[model samples]
Target: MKINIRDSTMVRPATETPITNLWNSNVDLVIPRFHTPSVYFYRPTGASNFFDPQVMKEALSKALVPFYPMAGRLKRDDDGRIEIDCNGAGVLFVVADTPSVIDDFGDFAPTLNLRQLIPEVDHSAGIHSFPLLVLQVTFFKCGGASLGVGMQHHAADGFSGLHFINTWSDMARGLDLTIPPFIDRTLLRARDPPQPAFHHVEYQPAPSMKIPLDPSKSGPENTTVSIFKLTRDQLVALKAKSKEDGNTVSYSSYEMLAGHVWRSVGKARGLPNDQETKLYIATDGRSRLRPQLPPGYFGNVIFTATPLAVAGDLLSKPTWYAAGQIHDFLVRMDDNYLRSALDYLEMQPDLSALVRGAHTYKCPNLGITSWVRLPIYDADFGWGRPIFMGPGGIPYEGLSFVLPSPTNDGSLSVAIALQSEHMKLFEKFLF
Candidate 1:
């Protein structure tokens, strides 16, 4: 249950890379400047040299040849805007040993202890002093290993993050680059004389609750993180129940599952009928933009689709009602809407002034991110595919992640965080 750090070093690119300050798009600026932690568990293969640090370090250096941005540090421009200083300073790499076996982490629910596997950054040192990507490889007593990653949110979204990991694994397996990352982010640059035709409610200040409470002061002691699994049969039944109203419109697993969670959590909190609640769903803009961003494009290309409703209506309506609202809101996130959001962000005096709905996770709101279809288990460093992969920890109340099961079965793992008191009721209603 204890981790002992053996070595820590910086792994730079094997070859020289462009030493320039890369421009961060408006989308990147709005994202919180923090690391998103995740862990991958690989079972013991009985190999003598399993997950060798030297092998990993060499592979990572070569991988950085194309993913140079990950090897850089964040720097502010003269305008006080943030950009990536692609100086090839390198990423933080750590090697650790744990006496506990992989089986010690039964069910693999997110916990504070699991976070120790990932490298922690000292934010007090300032943004420019830390690496965008920090990683650790922990060896267990059972010969199994865990790969912990802390990728900066400003650098990439879930899709881009996984893309980078997959590429690194490919190189570790001694394979050539399959698809070089499209590094140019200027494609999303704001148009001349930016025109914001839409209201862009997602970027506006959050609505005040009945009793206003600062989310920053809400300590982690009151929050509980847990993972809920929906079996294949349950998923099918839930989808069928959502279509019971003769509504021919089909809904994806994300819509149905997210809607169900929103309604359940609303009821669990026991909010008044007049209280208002909102559901913030993360939407990827890779294919939503005109001319479409390239498949290999790297960076944050995501936006939140906020769907609001009164507590009474949300709790009283059928599951499809909430699902339909989620679907409808996402349907309008086309090229025009995305461009309008970018323009609105460009017009803001300071990007940090806008209210991010995620900040209100403990309020009468919920933020659900779907990582279902992404390549979550592709990190095979010649040993074998990971047995499990998921967020190292859920730090915010009401924040949830929907991820595909590592078994590759038609099931899902919903990792959620909520107040300890509300969590009990939330679990009761989840079924």
Candidate 2:
């Protein structure tokens, strides 16, 4: 697992591009003051570009020209809120080599050793000095390699982050990008007086803890992470059950899968029959906007829906009904709901209110987000799509990311992290 660090330096844009410094309302709402990490693993493809640091460095430099904000650093605004300082400071890109082969770590599940493949940073310098984007390219002994990416969450969401990486990969492969990212931020600017149109409880229902629980000191220190695969056949069976019991509404792969996981998590935790359990389903509000946003308009355009139910009712009832409930939550995000969410953010400038997932880390509640349709494996730098890819780590229990299997054979792969005790019971439900 030892990674010998080679050359490390700042990668600036190929050419200077003028941009003003600011973080829009969407950026301010992201609670985690850390980077969202990911790794793309590739086998020995005999193509040197995949592992060549010079090739990647040059490509990343070119990619930053259009996505210039990513090459900047984080800064604090007048109100003490964190925002991206578009100073063209350049992003941190690292090159390293590992003696281990990909097969040495079977199945590619997340583990502490995986962290070695990612770049190291000194977060103690505070967000203002931290680079907005950091990346590492580690070559394996077998000619295999991993591309690790860490993007500060405040600057972009999963959508924008992937877009930037794909653009960089496209530059490396010398491919024409189909669409350029729209960088205008005024559309999401806070209202003049900041009038909230609807209730904002959905995003910030839980109050900040009295004594914020340190994750390491929390009881789930022995958390275990694993990837659970649901074959195409299993998915079809779940959908069938959903169709049979639900009134006429059809179920999507998302709803069926979410309901099944929610049920399983609840049962695994052994929640009391009457205890109330909530499933926080992250829903994208892009298409639901009043005047639907353009294709490339990106940032944090997502919202979380808390689907609620009693433990016994959720478990004893037909699973289709459970799925129906989840479907209903998404359907409720009409134009009005999305606008209200925006206006609500405008009114609540505290920013910390958006940190809702913190409570779920300790409670029996679970957070489920879908990356099923995202082009996660398509960042091909002429080496073809990655053989394996996933989030870098699951720091908290009770949080899960549902992704499409790399095989593209209609099956699903879920990366889940939970307390060691609950993982055992959860595996039973999944198998």
Best by TM-score: 1
lDDT of 2 at 330: 83
Listed in order, each prediction's TM-score against the native is 0.96, 0.92
Among all windows of 10 consecutive residues in model 1, the one with the lowest summed lDDT is: 211-220
Indicate which candidate wins on lDDT: 1
- Tell me the lDDT of model 1 at 232: 84
lDDT of 1 by residue, 142-243 (tens): 999999999988889888888889889988999978877898889989888999989876775544468665444344777778888888888888877776
**lDDT (Cα, 0-100) at 33 in candidate 2:** 53
Instruction: Rate residue 234 of model 2 by lDDT.
Output: 86
User: How well does model 1 score by local distance difference test?
Assistant: 0.85
The reply for model 2, stretches above 4 Å from the true place, is 190-197, 206-220, 243-249
Write one digit per residue (lDDT tens) for candidate 2, span 219-315. 5567887878888998888777765644677788788788889888878877777777778877777777777767666567767677777888988
340 in model 1: Cα distance from truth in Å? 1.0
